[PDB]
């Protein structure tokens, strides 16, 4: 389930293992520290649906 922390770990492992996943979903990490230094990074996870690995 989503509540368990293994959800994100498994999604990251899937996107690291199956590099050629045509269908994907995005996860943007956005944090504005003090002095207004904006840090952004795009993390991709398998999109909702059925995937075969």
């Amino acid at each position: 389930p989503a509540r368990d922390r293994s959800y994100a770990w498994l999604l990251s492992w899937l996107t690291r293992h199956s590099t050629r996943t045509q269908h994907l979903s995005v996860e943007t990490s956005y944090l504005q520290h003090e002095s207004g230094r904006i840090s952004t990074k795009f993390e991709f996870i398998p999109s909702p649906g059925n995937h075969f690995i």
Binding site: H33, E34, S35, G36, R37, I38
Partner: protein, 243 residues
């Protein structure tokens, strides 16, 4: 692209760093002209210190570096510090150590609790170093805990004689630079900056005329003179002999 960065200067009340006022616009680095290559050298040294954290941690040395800027008043030291902090997207932590409100313990605590990604500026260092009031306590606090990481500290003095050679040492003040009175290149670059587009020969003649007229002319005085003849380069050039 739609966001313009700002520099937030932090002030210290009691024993805590507080946001002094509201965020301010970033002054362009090239606006503050120091010398032939002093700005380039300082920027390169800071970039090397920041972009290579592996070197310090692997060798077991604190990731702390400090610079000292000494020169006549009005030479553009604090303006250069602000421009550098804006360039590096850091935040300024202004601290007037000449004030007697803070003691050795308070100074050490303030330097230890400084915000991350922030430059700490200690102005009037010569004043209290002559004389809560302490001179050895300041250097003892400087060699304390080096914050979380990259405790870049800037200290400015009108003269370096009142200080001691012990201040200049690795693990302490690292790169001392002297910012002084304007030169020919300084004056011509200032004339080109304040007035956006004129005859370069006119700027050179202006610089030579001020160099002849005054020997210890400060950039602050140059800016003040330029304010008298705002949007009037020919009049300012004709009025150099008046100065």
């Amino acid at each position: 692209q739609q966001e313009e960065g700002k520099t937030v200067m932090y002030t210290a009340v009691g024993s805590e760093w507080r946001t002094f006022g509201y965020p301010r616009r970033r002054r362009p680095l090239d606006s503050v002209v120091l010398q032939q290559g002093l700005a380039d050298r300082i920027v390169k040294d800071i970039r090397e210190f920041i972009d290579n954290p592996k070197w310090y941690i692997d060798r077991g040395i604190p990731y702390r570096r400090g610079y000292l800027l000494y020169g006549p008043p009005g030479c553009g030291k604090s303006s250069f510090i602000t421009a550098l902090a804006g360039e590096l997207e850091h935040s300024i932590c202004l601290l007037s150590l000449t004030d007697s409100s803070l003691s050795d313990d308070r100074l050490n605590h303030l330097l230890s609790v400084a915000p991350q990604q922030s430059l700490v500026l200690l102005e009037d260092v010569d004043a209290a170093f002559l004389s809560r009031l302490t001179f050895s306590g300041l250097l003892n606090a400087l060699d304390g805990v080096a914050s979380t990481e990259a405790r870049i500290v800037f200290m400015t003095t009108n003269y370096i004689d009142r200080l001691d050679p012990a201040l200049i040492r690795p693990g302490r003040v690292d790169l001392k630079e002297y910012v002084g009175y304007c030169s020919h290149w300084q004056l011509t670059q200032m004339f080109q900056r304040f007035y956006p587009g004129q005859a370069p020969s006119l700027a050179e003649n202006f610089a030579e005329h001020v160099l002849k007229a005054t020997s210890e002319i400060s950039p602050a005085q140059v800016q003040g003179y330029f304010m008298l003849y705002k949007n009037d380069p020919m009049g300012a050039v004709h009025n150099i002999e008046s100065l």
